[PDB]
Amino acid sequence: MKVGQDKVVTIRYTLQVEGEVLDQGELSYLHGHRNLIPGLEEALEGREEGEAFQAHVPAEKAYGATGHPGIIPPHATLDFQVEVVKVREATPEELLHGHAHPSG
Ligand SMILES: C=CC[C@@H]1/C=C(\C)C[C@H](C)C[C@H](OC)[C@H]2O[C@@](O)(C(=O)C(=O)N3CCCC[C@H]3C(=O)O[C@H](/C(C)=C/[C@@H]3CC[C@@H](O)[C@H](OC)C3)[C@H](C)[C@@H](O)CC1=O)[C@H](C)C[C@@H]2OC
Numbered sequence: 001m002k003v004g005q006d007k008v009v010t011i012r013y014t015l016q017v018e019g020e021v022l023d024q025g026e027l028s029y030l031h032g033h034r035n036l037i038p039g040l041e042e043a044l045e046g047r048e049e050g051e052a053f054q055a056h057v058p059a060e061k062a063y064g065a066t067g068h069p070g071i072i073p074p075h076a077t078l079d080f081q082v083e084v085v086k087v088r089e090a091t092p093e094e095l096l097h098g099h100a101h102p103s104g
């Protein structure tokens with residue numbers, strides 16, 4: 001099923017800024033509830049389970065002028081390599097809380 005509003009989505013990601021890897025990992029989030037930076041949620045819209053893609057997110061849709069000191073510099077364009085690992089419906093409590101819960 002496709003990534004979209006009220007889906008719980010699991011992604012693997014690599015983050016680069018100016019060709020340097022800053023982070024890599026995996027996470028699950030509830031889509032459409034401001035869990036992620038808006039630029040990456042936009043790029044995730046309608047993606048299929050199993051789909052791999054790249055997203056280049058301008059600072060205005062990420063960490064902006066401030067960045068995130070210690071990780072993301074000011075005015076950084078974020079280059080993401082993403083794999084959509086899993087997509088499922090959110091449970092009632094996930095929807096109430098506005099976040100993802102583990103499955104086990
Ligand atoms: C206690 C809470 C910690 C909780 C941490 C986790 C679940 C672990 C999760 C793997 C995050 C990583 O931890 C190793 C690490 O991922 C980064 O390195 C990174 O690659 C990144 O940019 N990602 C992660 C991959 C999805 C896109 C983006 C994101 O949207 O991330 C989201 C994010 C930071 C959004 C902010 C929220 C504040 C807004 O103001 C700001 O708006 C400008 C946008 C993350 C997922 C939050 O939803 C949840 C958290 O924060 C950040 C550079 C710093 C972040 O560590 C903190």
Ligand SMILES: [Cl-]
Nearest residue numbers: 029030099100
């Ligand atoms: Cl979440």
Ligand SMILES: [Zn+2]
Nearest residue numbers: 005006032095
């Ligand atoms: Zn919702």
Ligand SMILES: [Zn+2]
Nearest residue numbers: 093097099101
């Ligand atoms: Zn909860």
